[PDB]
Design a binder for this molecule. Structure first.
Ligand code: BB2
Ligand code: BB2
Lengths: 158, 158
């Protein structure tokens, strides 16, 4: 079932989401299913549970190919100090883009929907997507990370 | 003649505009006329010449009533350190609002389109409008002035 994506300005995007505690459940599987569907319909490369007003530490992503992944209770460690700029837009902020600095190299850990542990090293785009979806789980959006405001503008214009 | 308002992301909104040097001219009067018209059609309380891709130190405004004013070669002095928060949206950024801190009290100086000198003390909303239009003449947009990003979001949602 495709879900309504909520837009910036909604308080539910500013929460810090609790953990998933129903790994392996039919409810979690249905919810993840919906997230993949909602992501594909909206043409995103990532989607975070709060964007559909589900207050859960949960994200999906996949697209430099990134594997199709569902990740619960994500935690993230930078593997170095190196930052990299790249373009981002948020489906909660349709039409806009900015250049965002992110870690070039990360580790991420959590759980696949069935309970399998996931741990991966990621770089570049793969790392960016995960850092972006992570920010949602802690009530953080990309505009508060913009350093150069000349780069912030509408996609069709920029 | 109503003018197309250009949107954030356009480089022409990032310029520092030169001075008006044709006070009292038919060309300036036509341009100001157009600005008042474009402002009214877009339902704004202010409009700055760069927003219609005219690279000129020129703004219009008027709406706590603010008088209907056309102001060329504006310069602005704070009359105190006191800041005040208020909501703003920009016709170059349709749909969005944020809370922006501005001086509560200003002086502004320039010229009416016919050459008459204008100097005024302004406070609160009147002062905000002028500070906002001023920022456009120096390539500055409100998002780079946001302090609390929780307040940045879409009008219909916020
Ligand atoms: C890149 C950081 C990950 C962004 C995630 C968003 C989706 C989203 O809002 N997730 O929470 C997305 O798919 N955004 C895309 C995006 O920003 N892209 C697509 C490819 C490159 C990059 C900038 O263009 C498009 C739909 C705007
Ligand atoms: C308040 C600072 C002046 C903003 C000027 C803008 C117009 C603009 O983009 N000028 O350069 C406007 O009219 N914005 C309005 C606006 O921000 N308003 C209308 C009244 C109160 C305030 C916030 O709601 C509406 C159309 C979004």
């Amino acid at each position: 079932m495709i879900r309504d994506i909520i837009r910036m300005g909604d308080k539910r995007l500013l929460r810090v989401a609790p953990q998933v505690t129903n790994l392996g459940s039919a409810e979690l599987h249905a919810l993840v299913s919906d997230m993949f569907e909602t992501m594909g319909a909206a043409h995103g490369v990532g989607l975070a549970a709060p964007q559909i007003a589900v207050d859960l530490q949960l994200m999906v992503f996949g697209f430099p190919a990134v594997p199709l992944t569902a990740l619960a209770n994500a935690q993230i460690e930078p593997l170095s100090d190196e930052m990299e700029n790249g373009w981002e837009g948020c489906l909660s902020i349709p039409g806009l883009r900015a250049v965002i600095p992110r870690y070039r190299y990360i580790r991420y850990r959590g759980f696949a929907p069935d309970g399998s542990p996931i741990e991966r090293e990621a770089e570049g785009f793969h790392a960016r997507v995960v850092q972006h979806e992570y920010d949602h789980l802690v009530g953080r959006l990309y505009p508060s990370r913009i350093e150069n405001f000349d780069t912030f503008g509408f996609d069709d214009v920029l």
